[PDB]
């Protein structure tokens, strides 16, 4: 509530990594790479039009899970919101290292091990307080942030001027193989739709302010993205192997003068930690929706939500169990697996845009028919362009989803359909 | 709000078969299932079966065959036939109803019902008596005067007194066969003062056999 | 074939009395639902999933039960209360009902308001007479006539009763009891009398006319 | 139909690499192998509990997918049948290779590329046929040949006599115990070849259920009264066996001389699960088409499954992965297929959990675990197979789902619908 501060959580829950997203894929080139931005952009348009659409007929809760769960039943429904709900706080632990580390990186307050492990856990609390009272204030919060963060990036372009590049610097391979290698990067960055359907429940006025945050908050990252990655593969720290090596940040600076005092760090770590709250925000929606039907424990649903200190005792054990042990093998990787876990609602979700909502369609249906295909071949890809390893504890995750479920709901579960009898 | 209203008819003749509709509305027909339940005799009810306007659909065991739940997505309802009837099989009024959900497990809907006779007695139109108070005025407080309606075997009447607008102090009887004949009656009650002055006459209708007659009482 | 078997088959309970039906089940279940239907009209949801309740109902309802004993409960009586509430299920194939359990409203005892008729003119003008006896606003249900009366003879065949549900507005019953015969037996005799033996009353309360 | 047919079948669709099993697991020692039988066996055994008890209460058209159908719905019915479809059949073309390499391994008849793969297409459509004509005569079939392919096994005990053989790769013996297990675990893909055969198989909700424990407790045997009886004594050392694929190397130490009969019917043990599998193809092929799920070809007049549609794959398949240059990525399939195959096996146990619920007795508990460890089973089963193979497993997954909301748009019915 209302739009404009939602809006810029769409896009925030997005751009978490926007700053320092460039160098990590001008490794693959830069010039060949905004042939990329493309293939990207459609594609994850085509979901946030999927959201859109499914938020439009049905403000939920809610999910996603919500549609998951009209969609394919309660089963789905509930292994959607674990998956989700994992994916939300599982991912805030990678956020504080960084977030803390654009802060005590640039100055340098301090670095050390349990010196930056406590001021972790210790902002994770200041947002998961923030949470536990006031979903508007911290979406004020983030709000604040995310234009803060925007600062350099919207102030970046200013574009002159720009200087020939490596264009297709990347590893040899033909034109197809080389944009693939692209994708492993720009397919992730776009993990922030679906912030305003999740959201909902909360964000008010909905049924038309959620469709639109989900359109708006990817626009706008999508104009930031391909507005930024451009505007410094030409001309700032080129060429390809310039950038390749070192972290970006204060190379922002030389080619056309800013000096430094680099305050973009300052400002690139609040973009960091403004999308811990909300991220945390949708951890306890995803719970509460859950736990408001016969799938989920209770306790996540009690006005916010009071259990959203669950979420925050249990990304304190896995902050610790990851910086002070040395291994760190089994906390390092599952922050890794989590990312997937992200994609399986977005698959549902257009699965379920179709099999729902087949008749509010116009009928042009043949528009929204493909739409939907756009979106799904997009997650589809987005996980084939993921290296085995991860993917396949993603599955070993649903392996044991199932079996947890057939052992908690054995009795509460209403089975269609059901024996006979005798 | 869903609707989901059936038809009145019929009465129907032993070996014979019938069949029964229920079109539903404010809903889309082809999201939900319909179902089927007869009960007898003011007694319990038996679930029949359910059809998927979609395709395919599930007959309650017991009643194998002796029925077939069919339906048309266009008109927007859902044919039910009963294929052998007998004597006893006879309604039991048929419900309609669709649950809120689907899967699993409530009925949330109900059809109004379809009352369903099953015998080879022929279609009689009654015979609408005025009765006449009391013998002797001048006497009590208020009046009580009657209404009969005997001879017919098509089962749904409607006795009505000064076309719905007395409806105080009116109880009317169910019917009574003694043999292959429906035979029913009815009471008012109004003041002394009321009756004598005013007309109070009892709209007999009769639909089955398409036999209004409206008599009126008088001393 | 999972019996729902439904008890108690019928009670009565005064405005404010605690009310309380159960529900057995030949096997266990999970989840039981409970409709109430008022005089033989379509049914209506009222307990859903064991102990929800629905749009409408009242917060006086209530629901619980597991396994193979379900109840349903209200802590003070109404006259709306009154119907029969059925139970049924849907854990197993095919979904079944329970017997029902039919539900009265307790008044204080009242006597029969009684009033006798004459056949009808348009009646004896086609070969057919009827005595027409209106038993009305008594309880409880339990009452009986008097096999009419005709010179002090009391005819047994050609009695035709038929008994109100239960008035909505003062919760008493009616009782209708018709003598017919032909029209010689009408005018054969001329003292006809038609009595009622309520249990509000050792004494029959009784009509008569003559011709 | 009856019995006996089919608890060989059971048995049958488990050991069609029960010859050759051994060697294979030699690597990882043979010792302190026995000392990894029983986690299979007992994991095992759970499952094969599961799949008895669940076509007690149901002798279905029929899965697996009709019980995950019931469970779950008409969605994870649809999948299970799909993933269960190719793993019958895309597991075959697996079967003919071996199956004829060992024939034309022995004598040896042909050999070359364009030659081999020609038999097998032949011997394919020879099983195809069997199955779209005598779901009796097929089973009449396998229960010949896997009769003929135990002759071996069930003559190898016969002990006379073991010699003191954890010759494993350097690690602790729970991490010894692992690496056995990516060769015991699979080799029980045996089961549910009763659940799916039922509505064929006659006098179900009993023999089902009977051959779904027998067939086990029959290949349970086989395995630990061959491995044991070889890892001591024929052909120790571990390092003799480690390198070439066991046969005639049971032949020298207790037995006869030259001329091997024992590829000679340990080459119809591989051939008559080649049969038995197309006809589950269809079965659980048929038992989707009957309902809204699944193409409707697949169930016909004919009192006998559409048969062929999986022949003509089956060829397609077999071609584009012999004849061809690439060659890999079509052979990768072969592997992943397999893991299809767990799947169901997962739904089938939530299912006999979710769904009979009642008929426990209540001996709950016991069931409760029962259903927990095949549970496990099916999860360890899956952790101990290369990531590569799993994450195509997934990715069929993320196809089946959208290939569902594309096809049924409409034909779905969505609990809980929308509104207005």
Same mark, same amino acid.
């Given at each position: 509530?209302?739009?404009?501060?939602?809006?810029?959580?769409?896009?925030?829950?997005?751009?978490?990594?926007?700053?320092?997203?460039?160098?990590?894929?001008?490794?693959?080139?830069?010039?060949?790479?905004?042939?990329?931005?493309?293939?990207?952009?459609?594609?994850?348009?085509?979901?946030?039009?999927?959201?859109?659409?499914?938020?439009?007929?049905?403000?939920?809760?809610?999910?996603?899970?919500?549609?998951?769960?009209?969609?394919?039943?309660?089963?789905?429904?509930?292994?959607?919101?674990?998956?989700?709900?994992?994916?939300?706080?599982?991912?805030?632990?990678?956020?504080?290292?960084?977030?803390?580390?654009?802060?005590?990186?640039?100055?340098?307050?301090?670095?050390?091990?349990?010196?930056?492990?406590?001021?972790?856990?210790?902002?994770?609390?200041?947002?998961?307080?923030?949470?536990?009272?006031?979903?508007?204030?911290?979406?004020?919060?983030?709000?604040?942030?995310?234009?803060?963060?925007?600062?350099?990036?919207?102030?970046?372009?200013?574009?002159?001027?720009?200087?020939?590049?490596?264009?297709?610097?990347?590893?040899?391979?033909?034109?197809?193989?080389?944009?693939?290698?692209?994708?492993?990067?720009?397919?992730?960055?776009?993990?922030?739709?679906?912030?305003?359907?999740?959201?909902?429940?909360?964000?008010?006025?909905?049924?038309?302010?959620?469709?639109?945050?989900?359109?708006?908050?990817?626009?706008?990252?999508?104009?930031?993205?391909?507005?930024?990655?451009?505007?410094?593969?030409?001309?700032?720290?080129?060429?390809?192997?310039?950038?390749?090596?070192?972290?970006?940040?204060?190379?922002?600076?030389?080619?056309?003068?800013?000096?430094?005092?680099?305050?973009?760090?300052?400002?690139?770590?609040?973009?960091?930690?403004?999308?811990?709250?909300?991220?945390?925000?949708?951890?306890?929606?995803?719970?509460?929706?859950?736990?408001?039907?016969?799938?989920?424990?209770?306790?996540?649903?009690?006005?916010?939500?009071?259990?959203?200190?669950?979420?925050?005792?249990?990304?304190?054990?896995?902050?610790?169990?990851?910086?002070?042990?040395?291994?760190?093998?089994?906390?390092?990787?599952?922050?890794?697996?989590?990312?997937?876990?992200?994609?399986?609602?977005?698959?549902?979700?257009?699965?379920?845009?179709?099999?729902?909502?087949?008749?509010?369609?116009?009928?042009?249906?043949?528009?929204?028919?493909?739409?939907?295909?756009?979106?799904?071949?997009?997650?589809?890809?987005?996980?084939?362009?993921?290296?085995?390893?991860?993917?396949?504890?993603?599955?070993?995750?649903?392996?044991?989803?199932?079996?947890?479920?057939?052992?908690?709901?054995?009795?509460?579960?209403?089975?269609?359909?059901?024996?006979?009898?005798? | 709000?869903?609707?989901?209203?059936?038809?009145?008819?019929?009465?129907?003749?032993?070996?014979?078969?019938?069949?029964?509709?229920?079109?539903?509305?404010?809903?889309?027909?082809?999201?939900?299932?319909?179902?089927?339940?007869?009960?007898?005799?003011?007694?319990?009810?038996?679930?029949?079966?359910?059809?998927?306007?979609?395709?395919?659909?599930?007959?309650?065991?017991?009643?194998?065959?002796?029925?077939?739940?069919?339906?048309?997505?266009?008109?927007?309802?859902?044919?039910?036939?009963?294929?052998?009837?007998?004597?006893?099989?006879?309604?039991?009024?048929?419900?309609?109803?669709?649950?809120?959900?689907?899967?699993?497990?409530?009925?949330?809907?109900?059809?109004?019902?379809?009352?369903?006779?099953?015998?080879?007695?022929?279609?009689?139109?009654?015979?609408?008596?005025?009765?006449?108070?009391?013998?002797?005025?001048?006497?009590?407080?208020?009046?009580?005067?009657?209404?009969?309606?005997?001879?017919?075997?098509?089962?749904?009447?409607?006795?009505?007194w000064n076309?719905?607008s007395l409806?105080?102090?009116?109880?009317?009887?169910?019917?009574?066969?003694?043999?292959?004949?429906?035979?029913?009656?009815?009471?008012?009650?109004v003041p002394?003062s009321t009756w004598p002055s005013e007309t109070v006459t009892?709209?007999?209708?009769?639909?089955?056999?398409?036999?209004?007659?409206?008599?009126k009482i008088v001393? | 074939?999972?019996?729902?078997?439904?008890?108690?088959?019928?009670?009565?309970?005064?405005?404010?009395?605690?009310?309380?039906?159960?529900? =057995?089940?030949?096997? @266990?279940?999970?989840?039981?639902?409970?409709?109430?239907?008022? $005089? &033989? #009209? +379509?049914?209506?949801?009222? *307990?859903?999933?064991? =102990?929800?309740?629905? @749009?409408?109902?009242?917060?006086?309802?209530?629901?619980?039960? $597991? &396994? #193979? +004993?379900?109840?349903?409960? *209200?802590?003070?009586?109404?006259?709306?209360?009154?119907?029969?509430?059925?139970?049924?299920?849907?854990?197993?194939?095919?979904?079944?009902?329970?017997?029902?359990?039919?539900?009265?409203?307790?008044?204080?005892?009242?006597?029969?308001?009684?009033?006798?008729?004459?056949?009808?003119?348009?009646?004896?003008?086609?070969?057919?007479?009827?005595?027409?006896?209106?038993?009305?606003?008594?309880?409880?249900?339990?009452?009986?006539?008097?096999?009419?009366?005709?010179?002090?003879?009391?005819?047994?065949?050609?009695?035709?009763?038929?008994?109100?549900?239960?008035?909505?507005?003062?919760?008493?019953?009616?009782?209708?009891?018709?003598?017919?015969?032909?029209?010689?037996?009408?005018?054969?005799?001329?003292?006809?009398?038609?009595?009622?033996?309520?249990?509000?009353?050792?004494?029959?309360?009784?009509?008569?006319?003559?011709?």
């Amino acid at each position: 509530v209302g739009l404009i501060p939602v809006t810029l959580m769409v896009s925030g829950n997005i751009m978490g990594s926007g700053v320092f997203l460039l160098p990590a894929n001008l490794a693959a080139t830069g010039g060949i790479a905004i042939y990329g931005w493309l293939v990207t952009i459609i594609g994850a348009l085509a979901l946030s039009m999927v959201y859109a659409k499914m938020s439009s007929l049905d403000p939920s809760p809610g999910g996603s899970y919500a549609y998951a769960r009209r969609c394919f039943g309660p089963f789905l429904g509930y292994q959607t919101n674990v998956l989700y709900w994992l994916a939300c706080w599982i991912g805030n632990i990678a956020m504080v290292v960084i977030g803390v580390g654009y802060l005590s990186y640039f100055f340098p307050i301090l670095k050390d091990p349990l010196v930056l492990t406590l001021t972790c856990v210790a902002v994770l609390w200041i947002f998961v307080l923030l949470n536990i009272v006031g979903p508007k204030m911290i979406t004020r919060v983030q709000a604040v942030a995310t234009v803060l963060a925007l600062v350099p990036i919207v102030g970046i372009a200013v574009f002159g001027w720009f200087w020939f590049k490596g264009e297709w610097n990347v590893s040899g391979m033909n034109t197809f193989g080389a944009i693939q290698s692209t994708l492993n990067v720009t397919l992730w960055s776009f993990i922030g739709v679906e912030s305003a359907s999740v959201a909902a429940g909360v964000v008010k006025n909905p049924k038309r302010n959620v469709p639109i945050a989900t359109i708006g908050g990817v626009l706008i990252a999508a104009v930031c993205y391909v507005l930024s990655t451009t505007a410094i593969m030409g001309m700032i720290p080129n060429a390809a192997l310039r950038v390749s090596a070192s972290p970006f940040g204060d190379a922002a600076r030389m080619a056309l003068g800013d000096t430094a005092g680099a305050i973009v760090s300052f400002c690139a770590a609040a973009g960091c930690l403004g999308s811990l709250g909300g991220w945390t925000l949708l951890a306890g929606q995803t719970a509460k929706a859950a736990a408001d039907d016969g799938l989920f424990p209770p306790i996540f649903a009690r006005t916010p939500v009071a259990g959203l200190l669950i979420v925050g005792v249990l990304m304190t054990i896995f902050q610790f169990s990851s910086m002070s042990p040395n291994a760190a093998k089994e906390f390092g990787l599952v922050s890794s697996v989590s990312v997937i876990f992200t994609l399986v609602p977005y698959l549902y979700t257009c699965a379920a845009l179709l099999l729902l909502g087949h008749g509010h369609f116009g009928k042009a249906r043949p528009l929204y028919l493909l739409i939907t295909f756009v979106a799904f071949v997009y997650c589809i890809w987005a996980v084939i362009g993921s290296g085995a390893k991860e993917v396949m504890w993603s599955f070993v995750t649903l392996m044991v989803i199932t079996a947890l479920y057939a052992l908690n709901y054995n009795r509460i579960h209403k089975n269609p359909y059901p024996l006979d009898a005798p | 709000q869903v609707q989901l209203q059936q038809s009145g008819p019929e009465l129907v003749k032993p070996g014979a078969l019938v069949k029964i509709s229920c079109k539903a509305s404010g809903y889309t027909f082809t999201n939900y299932d319909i179902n089927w339940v007869k009960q007898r005799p003011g007694q319990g009810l038996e679930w029949i079966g359910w059809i998927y306007p979609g395709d395919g659909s599930t007959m309650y065991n017991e009643k194998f065959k002796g029925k077939a739940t069919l339906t048309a997505d266009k008109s927007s309802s859902t044919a039910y036939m009963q294929l052998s009837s007998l004597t006893s099989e006879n309604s039991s009024v048929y419900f309609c109803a669709r649950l809120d959900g689907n899967y699993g497990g409530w009925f949330a809907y109900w059809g109004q019902g379809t009352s369903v006779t099953v015998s080879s007695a022929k279609t009689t139109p009654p015979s609408v008596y005025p009765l006449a108070p009391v013998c002797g005025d001048t006497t009590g407080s208020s009046v009580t005067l009657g209404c009969l309606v005997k001879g017919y075997f098509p089962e749904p009447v409607t006795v009505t007194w000064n076309s719905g607008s007395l409806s105080s102090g009116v109880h009317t009887f169910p019917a009574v066969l003694q043999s292959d004949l429906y035979t029913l009656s009815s009471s008012v009650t109004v003041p002394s003062s009321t009756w004598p002055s005013e007309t109070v006459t009892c709209n007999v209708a009769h639909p089955a056999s398409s036999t209004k007659v409206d008599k009126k009482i008088v001393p | 074939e999972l019996v729902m078997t439904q008890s108690p088959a019928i009670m009565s309970a005064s405005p404010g009395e605690k009310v309380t039906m159960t529900c =057995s089940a030949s096997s @266990s279940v999970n989840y039981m639902h409970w409709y109430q239907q008022k $005089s &033989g #009209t +379509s049914p209506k949801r009222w *307990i859903y999933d064991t =102990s929800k309740l629905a @749009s409408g109902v009242p917060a006086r309802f209530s629901g619980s039960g $597991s &396994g #193979t +004993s379900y109840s349903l409960t *209200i802590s003070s009586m109404e006259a709306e209360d009154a119907a029969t509430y059925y139970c049924q299920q849907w854990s197993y194939n095919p979904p079944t009902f329970g017997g029902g359990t039919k539900l009265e409203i307790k008044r204080a005892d009242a006597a029969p308001t009684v009033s006798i008729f004459p056949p009808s003119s348009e009646q004896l003008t086609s070969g057919g007479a009827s005595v027409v006896c209106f038993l009305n606003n008594f309880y409880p249900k339990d009452i009986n006539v008097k096999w009419k009366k005709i010179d002090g003879s009391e005819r047994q065949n050609g009695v035709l009763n038929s008994w109100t549900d239960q008035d909505s507005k003062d919760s008493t019953y009616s009782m209708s009891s018709t003598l017919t015969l032909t029209k010689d037996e009408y005018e054969r005799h001329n003292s006809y009398t038609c009595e009622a033996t309520h249990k509000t009353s050792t004494s029959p309360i009784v009509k008569s006319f003559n011709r």
